[PDB]
C-alpha cells in the first residue's frame, strides 16, 4: 500500500509540469497569431466606430 502511495509523492509536480508544458505552444501561439491578425481587426473596429449611423428610428 505504501509503495503505491509513494508513487505520486514526487510525480505530482512532474505531471503538473507535464500538463503545463502541454499548454504552452498553442498557449503562446494564441498571442502570436493574434498579433499577426491585429492590424485587420483594429482597423476594421476603428472604421466601424468612425462611420456615421444616422437614422430617424423608423417607428
Amino acid at each position: 500500500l505504501k509503495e503505491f502511495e509513494q508513487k505520486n509523492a514526487g510525480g505530482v509536480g512532474e505531471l503538473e509540469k507535464k500538463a503545463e508544458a502541454g499548454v504552452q505552444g498553442e498557449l503562446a501561439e494564441i498571442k502570436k497569431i493574434a498579433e499577426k491578425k491585429k492590424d485587420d481587426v483594429v482597423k476594421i473596429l476603428i472604421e466601424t466606430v468612425i462611420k456615421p449611423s444616422a437614422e430617424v428610428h423608423i417607428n
Binding site: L45, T48, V49, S53, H57
Partner: protein
C-alpha cells in the same frame, strides 16, 4: 456557414443609448418616470444613485410617455431629484459559448468563479420559443444514475421529466449532489453533460455545493448557476430559464445529452407570488395567481427529444410539500405536466435508511420504453415487478404481526417478512458515496429473490427464472 453574415453585421453595428433624469416618484419596490421616448416593454435599465452606486432594473409596464420600472436590488434610500438611468435599448440577453463548462455563475448569470469573463461566442434571448410537436419523438434508452433504488425500479428514459417530492425535514440536496457525482450514461462522457441551478439555498449549503462539486472532479461535465437566499427575489425567476436556454443551446447545437435539476420549485413559486403583487391583481386560489399552470408548463416544456438531432434533454426538478401532503396547488398541477413521481419517506429517515426513499407511491410513467434489451438485461423489467409485489406482501406481513399473532403468519408470510427486512436494509440503503452499476444492483436483487422457492415467483417467464435462478 451563412449566419456569419448576420454575426458580422450586428457585431459591427453600434448604436448609442439615452439617459434620463425624470424620476416622478418611487412607490415601494417600484419607480415611475414620466418623460420617456419610444419605451420598449420589459427591458433592462441601469440606475445610478446620487452617490456613485449603480443597480439594475427592468421595465414593468408602459403608458403614453410613461413607464414603470422595478429595481432588482430594491429602492432603498434612493433620490428623486439627483438620479439618472440609461436604457440598453434591448431586452435582457445572455452571452453563450460552448465553454461555460467548469465555470460558475450568479443569479444574474455573471461569473462568480473569479475567472475571466465568459467571452460570449454569441448572445441569445433569455427565453426561448415553443417547439413543433411535429418535430419531436418519444424517449427510450434509459439513462444510468448509479442509484440502485431508482434505476432498478424506476428507470428514466432519455427525456422523461420526473419531479421529486420532499418535505421540510428531508435531506434531498445531498441526493442531488450524489446523483450529479454518479450521473452518467450506461455502458453497452461521449456527449453527456450536466447543468445545475439552485434557488435560495443556505450559505453553508452553497459552500457545500461548490466544494463538493469541485473536489468530485466532475465540474468539467457541469456548469453551475446559483441563487442565494439573500438574493433579491426578482433574480429568482431569472435563473431557471437561463439554465434552460444554455441546455437548449448545447443539446441542439452540440448534440450533448443533458440533464439538469432545479433545487426547489417551491421557492420559485413563492418568488412568483411576490410578482404580480406589484400590480393590482388579487391572486387565485390559496392566494396564488392562476397562470402558474401556464408558466410552470412553459419552463418544463423545453425538455424533449428532436428527431433531426442527437440532442437528449432531460429535466428532474424537486419540490417541497408545505403541509406534508398532496393538496397544495403546486404538487397537484405538477402531477399533470409531469410523468411519474418520486416520494421520499420521512419515517424511513426516522429509520435512518439513507436515502429515506420509498417506492409504493412512486412510479415511472414511461419506463416501459426504456427497459427493453440492447440497453439492459431482459429480466430487468419484470424482476422489478416481482420485487415490488414481494415488498407489498412484506408490508402486509409486518402488519400481520400482532393482529392475530406473530407465529400465525404463513411460511409465505414469514419468507416475505425476512425478505422485507433484508432488502430494505441492504438493497435500499446506499452509502453517501456508494456507487452501484445497474448490473450489480440487479445481481443483488437476484440474490434477494432466491430467498423464495422458484415457484413462489409466479410473475416471470419460465426461461428467465430458470436461467437467473441457477447461477
Amino acid at each position: 456557414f451563412a449566419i456569419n453574415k448576420k454575426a458580422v453585421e450586428q457585431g459591427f453595428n453600434v448604436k448609442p443609448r439615452l439617459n434620463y433624469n425624470t424620476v416622478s416618484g418611487v412607490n415601494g419596490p417600484l419607480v415611475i418616470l414620466e418623460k420617456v421616448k419610444f419605451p420598449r416593454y420589459n427591458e433592462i435599465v441601469n440606475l445610478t444613485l446620487p452617490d456613485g452606486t449603480v443597480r439594475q432594473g427592468q421595465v414593468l409596464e408602459i403608458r403614453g410617455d410613461r413607464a414603470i420600472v422595478q429595481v432588482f436590488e430594491g429602492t432603498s434610500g434612493i433620490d428623486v431629484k439627483k438620479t439618472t438611468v440609461e436604457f440598453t435599448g434591448e431586452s435582457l440577453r445572455i452571452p453563450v459559448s460552448e465553454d461555460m463548462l467548469g465555470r460558475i455563475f450568479d443569479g444574474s448569470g455573471r461569473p462568480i468563479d473569479n475567472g475571466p469573463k465568459v467571452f460570449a461566442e454569441d448572445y441569445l434571448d433569455i427565453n426561448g420559443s415553443p417547439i413543433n410537436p411535429y418535430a419531436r419523438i418519444y424517449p427510450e434508452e434509459m439513462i444510468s444514475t448509479g442509484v440502485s433504488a431508482i434505476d432498478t425500479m424506476n428507470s428514466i428514459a432519455r427525456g422523461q421529466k420526473i419531479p421529486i417530492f420532499s418535505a421540510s425535514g428531508l435531506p434531498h440536496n445531498e441526493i442531488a449532489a450524489q446523483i450529479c457525482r454518479q450521473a452518467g450514461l450506461v455502458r453497452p462522457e461521449e456527449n453527456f453533460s450536466i447543468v445545475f441551478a439552485a434557488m435560495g439555498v443556505n450559505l453553508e449549503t452553497a459552500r457545500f455545493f461548490k466544494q463538493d462539486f469541485e473536489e468530485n472532479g466532475s465540474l468539467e461535465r457541469t456548469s453551475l448557476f446559483l441563487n442565494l437566499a439573500n438574493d433579491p427575489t426578482i433574480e429568482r425567476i431569472i435563473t431557471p430559464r437561463l439554465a434552460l436556454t444554455t441546455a437548449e443551446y448545447l443539446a441542439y447545437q452540440t448534440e450533448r445529452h443533458v440533464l439538469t435539476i432545479l433545487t426547489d420549485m417551491s421557492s420559485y413559486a413563492d418568488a412568483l407570488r411576490e410578482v404580480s403583487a406589484a400590480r393590482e391583481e388579487v391572486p387565485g386560489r390559496r392566494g396564488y395567481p392562476g397562470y402558474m399552470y401556464t408558466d410552470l408548463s412553459t419552463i418544463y416544456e423545453r425538455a424533449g427529444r428532436v428527431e433531426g438531432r442527437n440532442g437528449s434533454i432531460t429535466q428532474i426538478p424537486i419540490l417541497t410539500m408545505p403541509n406534508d401532503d398532496i393538496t397544495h396547488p403546486i404538487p397537484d398541477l405538477t402531477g399533470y405536466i409531469t410523468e411519474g413521481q418520486i416520494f421520499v419517506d420521512r419515517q424511513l429517515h426516522n429509520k435512518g435508511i439513507y436515502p429515506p426513499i420509498n417506492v409504493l407511491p412512486s412510479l415511472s410513467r414511461l419506463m416501459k420504453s426504456a427497459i427493453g434489451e440492447g440497453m439492459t438485461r431482459k429480466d430487468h423489467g419484470d424482476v422489478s415487478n416481482q420485487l415490488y409485489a414481494k415488498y407489498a406482501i412484506g408490508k402486509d406481513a409486518a402488519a400481520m404481526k400482532a393482529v392475530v399473532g406473530e407465529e400465525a403468519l404463513s411460511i409465505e408470510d414469514k419468507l416475505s417478512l425476512e425478505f422485507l427486512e433484508k432488502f430494505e436494509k441492504t438493497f435500499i440503503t446506499q452509502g453517501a458515496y456508494e456507487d452501484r452499476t445497474v448490473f450489480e444492483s440487479l445481481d443483488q436483487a437476484w440474490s434477494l429473490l432466491r430467498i423464495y422457492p422458484k415457484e413462489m415467483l409466479n410473475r416471470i417467464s419460465p426461461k428467465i427464472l430458470d436461467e437467473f435462478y441457477d447461477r
